[PDB]
Amino acid sequence: HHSGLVKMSHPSGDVEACMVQVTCGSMTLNGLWLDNTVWCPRHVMCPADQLSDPNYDALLISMTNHSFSVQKHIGAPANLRVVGHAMQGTLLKLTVDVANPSTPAYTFTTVKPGAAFSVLACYNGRPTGTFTVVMRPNYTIKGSFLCGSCGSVGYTKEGSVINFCYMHQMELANGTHTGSAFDGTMYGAFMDKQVHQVQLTDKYCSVNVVAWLYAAILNGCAWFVKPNRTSVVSFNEWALANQFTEFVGTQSVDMLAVKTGVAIEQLLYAIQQLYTGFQGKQILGSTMLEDEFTPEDVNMQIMGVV
Amino acid sequence: HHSGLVKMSHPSGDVEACMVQVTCGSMTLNGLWLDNTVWCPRHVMCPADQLSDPNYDALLISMTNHSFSVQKHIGAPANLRVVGHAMQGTLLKLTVDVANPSTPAYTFTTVKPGAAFSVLACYNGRPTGTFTVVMRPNYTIKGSFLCGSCGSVGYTKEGSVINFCYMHQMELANGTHTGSAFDGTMYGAFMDKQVHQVQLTDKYCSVNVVAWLYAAILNGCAWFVKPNRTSVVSFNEWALANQFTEFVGTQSVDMLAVKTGVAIEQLLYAIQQLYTGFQGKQILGSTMLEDEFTPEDVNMQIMGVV
């Protein structure tokens, strides 16, 4: 009756040792300290009166290296001297005179819709919480962020290597959240300006609904499975009309098909039927489709496979 | 629209630094290394072919210090020599020759039904994931644990002090999980033997349902609020007949009533009506009552209280 699924985050210790507090004048938020670089949102430069339409190019011109104060509060505290400052998209790149001795092996990557990542929520340079989210098809995340959380970071892990993919920037009118990749772009079409912004429509993540149906099968809950099949191409035409992402299979889904003996196309048919309603029945304690678990969540948490 | 609530764990770094691998003969699992003590489940002493009815007192007598192999794998790796061994309830207390130099400030506490705690899932002494659960009224948790996860720990955090409350032991018939407190007791009526055990009925955690309804009110979703009230005494008679825990208000629930302007008794009334059905309506994206968020979650995540 319990699926064995939970919202699983990576252990956060490696990333904790990289978090700092960045202060520019009256403004403060979190930064990420890797090697001789500290990354943080560029609106730390912006007066509170100016956040709706800031001119970051002129703000940056007005700054000097001493404009920025960087502190490590956790572990062995440290004051970091800024010796260089640059802007890349919506992020600042501050050069500091000391390399982070706890720099992990890392990369910078962008995450795609439907993919899961771990977030270390920080306030005043101090990690306070960790959670995992799926990047939504409209480039928001359903997170938990308050004033002072900007510069909190999201990441995946491949082995010992941390792949940083997100730095938090803002909350939208519907309560969801968005931020930057570490190439400095904002996810989606968002702007780092405090103004109401058009938000694109969310969608069910089809590949993740398939993963959850396979999780149900692995738990012996298979009432929705029938011989009927919908091809991928036919389902993808259907998805465009019914607020679903288009389905693109992966070896992670294929492993679920093989372990369960249920074809992807059987679950694509099931989804089409279940989207019209569960008819009084339940799947893993839910009466609506679940898209917040990935094929990899299911392989790892239930079958122990990576 | 999105509530701003997520399953939020503590940052796990402090606890990661206390995890070790414990091997006894052919059995391996995880342990918790604090000062010169390593805690682990006592069934590490038990051969696989005897897990269904072990004689732990005789196993313990047969053991020597050299029967146990303890390794720290993460960070500065170490092989820890055992210099004393004892059993307390369902746990072993192994004395080792090195004190953990990363021992945090800590206590041992027991967690109560409805209360949330963070789990660090470990395999072979290596932390692999973190997630949060609430202790169910039947002293199980809806976790994500596989073979080799025993000895994984749960904890709360007050300031800098880690309060260890849970050490993982077993998975039950319905896919849920249970374990020990660090006084050696199993939560609930469970025994650390590989045999089917009666599981008590689960219940809705009334106080957490109240917190969730307040979260909904904080987000503009309050169609279920009426002037009508049910007193705590009347609600608690009803709860015993409808699979709910009895409601016991706390200062943290009182904070939510003040912040929302909605009395506890109004939401007790609502719960009774909602439990008969949402009449095809939704609360924070849900068509059923949610009891996996605590009054403290709502205060901290939505209001930023502590």
Q: Which residue of B has its CA nearest to A292?
A: B6
Nearest CA-CA distance, residue A242 and chain B, Å = 18
Dist CA B214 CA B163 (whole Å): 28
Provide the residue type at A131 as one letter: F
Dist CA B195 CA A279 (whole Å): 37
Pairing status of strand B161-171 against strand B106-108? parallel
Dist CA B98 CA B20 (whole Å): 13
Instruction: Please give the DSSP secondary-structure letter assigned to residue B129.
Output: E
Mutation site for A-interface testing, chosen from B130, B134, B168, B292 by largest number of A Cβ within 10 Å: B130
State in Å, rounded, how far the first CA of chain A is from the last one. Answer: 24
- Give the technique used to solve this structure: X-ray
Dist CA B85 CA B178 (whole Å): 24
Of A18, A150, A165, A205, which is the active-site residue?
Answer: A150
Dist CA A34 CA A182 (whole Å): 12
Residue B251, SS3 per DSSP: helix
| Cα–Cα distances in angstroms (integers) from residue A77 to residues A72, A73, A126, B81, B264, in the given order | 5, 5, 11, 33, 44
Closest by CA to A25, choosing from A67, A53, A65, A60, is: A67
What topology is assigned to B206-303 in CATH? main proteinase (3clpro) structure, domain 3 (1.10.1840)
Could you write out the DSSP letters of every residue in A92-120? EEEEESS--TTPPSEEE----TT-EEEEE
Burial B173-210 (b: 16+ CB within 10 A, else e): eebbbbbbbbebebbbebebbeeeeebeebbbbbbbbb
Dist CA A207 CA A212 (whole Å): 9
Known catalytic residues of B are 43, 150
Closest by CA to B27, choosing from B172, B182, B194, B165, is: B194
Contact A11 B127 (CB under 8 A): yes
Dist CA A165 CA A150 (whole Å): 14
Dist CA B37 CA B31 (whole Å): 10
What are the phi and psi torsion angles at B104 (to 5°)?
-75, 170
- Residue appearing with tokens 């889904």: A253
Burial (CB count within 10 angstroms: exposed 0-12, middle 13-18, buried 19+), residue B153 = buried
- Residue appearing with tokens 């904070």: B255
Element at B266 (helix H, strand E): helix B264-275
Provide the residue type at A50 as one letter: Q
Instruction: Beginning with the edge strand found earlier in the chain, give each strand of the sheet holding A68-72 in spatial order.
Output: A78-80, A68-72, A19-24, A27-34, A37-41, A91-96, A82-88
Q: Which residues of A touch B144 (CB under 8 A)?
A: 4-6, 8, 301
Contact status, residue B108 vs residue B164, Cβ threshold 8 Å: yes
Strand partners, A91: A41, A88
**Sign of the CA dihedral with A179 first, then A180, A186, and A188 last:** negative
Provide the residue type at B270 as one letter: A
Q: Which residues of B touch A120 (CB under 8 A)?
A: 11
What are the phi and psi torsion angles at B136 (to 5°)?
-75, 155
Pairing status of strand A27-34 against strand A153-158? unpaired
Closest by CA to B135, choosing from B175, B172, B178, B174, is: B178
| Cα–Cα distances in angstroms (integers) from residue B240 to residues A82, B138, B233, B292, in the given order | 62, 14, 11, 20
Strand partners, B141: B177
CA-angle at B126, arms to B122 and B130, nearest 5°? 45
State in Å, rounded, how far the first CA of chain B is from the last one. Answer: 24
Dist CA B215 CA B227 (whole Å): 19
Contact B6 A144 (CB under 8 A): yes
Burial B237-269 (b: 16+ CB within 10 A, else e): ebbeeeebbebeeeebbebbbebbebebbbbbb
Residue B283, SS3 per DSSP: strand
Nearest CA-CA distance, residue B243 and chain A, Å = 16
- Residue appearing with tokens 């795609």: A112
| Cα–Cα distances in angstroms (integers) from residue B283 to residues A93, A229, B209, B224, B274, in the given order | 42, 34, 12, 9, 10
Could you write out the DSSP letters of every residue in chain A? ---S---PBPP-HHHHTTEEEEEETTEEEEEEEETTEEEEEGGGGS-GGGTTS--HHHHHHH--GGGEEEEE-SSS-EEE-EEEEEEETTEEEEEESS--TTPPSEEE----TT-EEEEEEEETTEEEEEEEEE--TTS-B-----TT-TT-EEEEEETTEEEEEEEEEEE-TTS-EEEE-TTSPBSTT--SSSS----PPP-B-HHHHHHHHHHHHHTT--TT--S----HHHHHHHHHHTTBPPP---HHHHHHHHHHT--HHHHHHHHHHHHT--TT--BTTBSS---SS-HHHHHHHHH---
| Cα–Cα distances in angstroms (integers) from residue A50 to residues A45, A159, A214, B245, B266, in the given order | 10, 43, 50, 50, 43
Contact A16 B11 (CB under 8 A): yes
Pairing status of strand A106-108 against strand A161-171? parallel
What tokens appear for B275 in the block? 């439990």
Q: Which residue of A has its CA nearest to B4?
A: A144
Pairing status of strand B68-72 against strand B78-80? antiparallel
Strand partners, B68: B24
Nearest CA-CA distance, residue A147 and chain B, Å = 9
Rounded to the nearest 10 degrees, how much is the dihedral formed by the CA atoms of A294, A295, A298, A299? -140
Task: Region of A110 please: left (phi>0), alpha (psi -120 to 50) or beta.
Answer: beta
What tokens appear for A86 in the block? 């640059």
Q: Which residues of B touch A304 (CB under 8 A)?
A: 146-147
What tokens appear for B36 in the block? 């010169």
Q: Which residues of A touch B17 (CB under 8 A)?
A: 13
**What's the length of chain B?**
306
Dist CA B121 CA B128 (whole Å): 6
Contact status, residue B63 vs residue B85, Cβ threshold 8 Å: yes
**What's the length of chain A?**
306
Provide the residue type at B96 as one letter: V
- Residue appearing with tokens 């080799």: B148
Element at B121 (helix H, strand E): strand B116-123
Instruction: Please give the DSSP secondary-structure letter assigned to residue B18.
Output: T
**Using beta carbons and an 8 Å cutoff, which residues of A are at the interface with B?**
1-14, 16-17, 120-121, 127-131, 133, 142-144, 146-147, 174-176, 219, 287-288, 301, 304
Residue B15, SS3 per DSSP: helix
Burial (CB count within 10 angstroms: exposed 0-12, middle 13-18, buried 19+), residue A52 = exposed
| Cα–Cα distances in angstroms (integers) from residue A231 to residues A100, A132, A208, B97, B151, in the given order | 51, 32, 17, 62, 45
Q: Which residue of B has its CA nearest to A219?
A: B175
Instruction: Please give the DSSP secondary-structure letter assigned to residue B16.
Output: H
Contact status, residue A109 vs residue A62, Cβ threshold 8 Å: no
| Cα–Cα distances in angstroms (integers) from residue A247 to residues A262, A297, B128, in the given order | 16, 17, 29
Contact status, residue A128 vs residue A104, Cβ threshold 8 Å: no
Q: Is A12-96 CATH 2.40.10.10?
A: yes
Q: Which residues of B touch A219 (CB under 8 A)?
A: 175
Contact status, residue A154 vs residue A145, Cβ threshold 8 Å: no
Dist CA B239 CA B220 (whole Å): 27
Residues 6 or more apart in contact with residue A104 via CB below 8 angstroms: A14, A15, A17, A18, A160, A161, A162
What tokens appear for A262 in the block? 């249920």
